């Protein structure tokens, strides 16, 4: 069918996700702009850094349980971790708290390519989440209000 | 203390133009989906238009569309409505509602702003 | 309205007084049901949202429910305070618009 991309919630996931990835993996924030999005991506990054790190804290045990199962060390293991994705995320009832369980167990499976020197996969598995994701949630999320609602849906207010 | 508060009603001809606003307070604007309501004189709530926390998302009902632009400035905490070719069906006290991001229920209010579309 | 209510209620302090709310598989078939209380000559407060939450504030003799295209506002035990209109609300897929129901001025005889 047509390309991924032509789909601009598609673009703006892929941007979200691919920056959420790269700097939980480098350490290091990217200070260019977004492509994208633009203040609405700059929100939902601010929201997915807040919510993201306390989901892989709270998913440690499953989450280092799943790598296992997979026994990720190489490229082709990340071919093998779609086909598992996408079952396991298209069965039941869609949230915003499965999402960003799914975006968070990218994040740990990118800090794990960055100790085991596979930096160059990052690129693919934010591809392969934002394929899980947009490819099988798309008017769920069209009807949520895409990234807008997922920030505002998580928002909780000080202090 | 957690407010919303709507201007700019009065009276304005058939045809013609208004703006109204609406000074959000006490809350992140930002971080919150916007909508109008009005009620007619004796009449029931209409829902007239939303727009989500970065204007990504913006929606009308069919008796506005085309005549009415919703618009929200986060850096100043003011939601718009922009309403042109006013009609006498028009003629409502206008509320701006603050939308809950987990449940899409309108927790808070404003006092409303009365517009009467009259020659 | 796309929502379909009674426009009237009523009932003798005490009583237990229902509100029906009638609409179609796109809107309370698919969405959750929010209600609104409005006092006259005074802004809609939030009554219940997600079919059958009630906000702080909101005493617990108003309770809510869903059942496929319907939806229910229930007052256990009528109080003077409780004269009032009643509104539904649901997000429609279809239009991709809010529907409010009609409303219901509810009496305490």
């Known amino acids: 069918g047509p390309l991924g991309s032509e789909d601009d919630l598609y673009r703006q996931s892929l941007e979200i996700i691919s920056r959420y990835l790269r700097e939980q993996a480098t350490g290091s924030k990217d200070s260019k702009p977004l492509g994208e999005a633009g203040a609405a991506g700059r929100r939902a990054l601010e929201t997915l850094r807040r919510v993201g790190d306390g989901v892989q804290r709270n998913h440690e045990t499953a989450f280092q349980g799943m790598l296992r199962k997979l026994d990720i060390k190489n490229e082709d293991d990340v071919k093998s971790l779609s086909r598992v994705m996408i079952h396991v995320f298209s069965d039941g009832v869609t949230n915003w708290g499965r999402i960003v369980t799914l975006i968070s167990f990218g994040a740990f499976v990118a800090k794990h390519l960055k100790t085991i020197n596979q930096e160059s996969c990052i690129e693919p598995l934010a591809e392969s989440i934002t394929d899980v994701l947009v490819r099988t949630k798309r008017d769920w999320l069209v009807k949520q209000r895409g990234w807008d609602g997922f920030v505002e849906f998580f928002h909780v207010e000080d202090l | 203390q957690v407010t919303l508060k709507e201007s700019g009603g009065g009276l304005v001809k058939p045809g013609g133009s208004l703006r109204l606003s609406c000074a959000a307070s006490?809350?992140?604007?930002?971080?919150?989906?916007m909508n109008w309501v009005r009620q007619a004189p004796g009449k029931g709530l209409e829902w007239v238009s939303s727009?989500?926390?970065?204007?990504?998302?913006?929606y009308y009902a069919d008796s506005v569309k085309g005549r009415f632009t919703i618009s929200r400035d986060n850096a100043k905490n003011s939601l718009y409505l922009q309403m042109n070719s006013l009609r006498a069906e028009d003629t409502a006290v206008y509320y701006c509602?603050?939308?809950?991001?987990?449940?899409?229920?309108?927790?808070?209010w404003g006092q409303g702003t009365l517009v009467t579309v009259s020659a | 309205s796309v929502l379909t209510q009674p426009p009237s209620a009523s009932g003798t302090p005490g009583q237990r007084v229902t509100i029906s709310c009638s609409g179609s598989?796109?809107?309370?078939?698919?969405?959750?049901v929010n209600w609104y209380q409005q006092l006259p000559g005074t802004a809609p407060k939030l009554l219940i949202y997600?079919?059958?939450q009630r906000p702080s504030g909101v005493p617990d003799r108003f309770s809510g429910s869903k059942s496929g295209t319907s939806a229910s506002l229930a007052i256990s035990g009528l109080q003077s305070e409780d004269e009032a209109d009643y509104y539904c609300?649901?997000?429609?897929?279809?239009?991709?618009?809010?529907?409010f129901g009609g409303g219901t001025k509810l009496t305490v005889l």
């Open positions: 609300a649901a997000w429609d897929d279809s239009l991709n618009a809010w529907v």
């Open positions: 598989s796109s809107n309370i078939g698919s969405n959750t």
């Open positions: 509602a603050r939308q809950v991001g987990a449940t899409w229920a309108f927790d808070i």
């Open positions: 727009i989500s926390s970065s204007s990504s998302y913006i």
């Open positions: 006490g809350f992140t604007f930002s971080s919150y989906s």
């Open positions: 997600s079919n059958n």
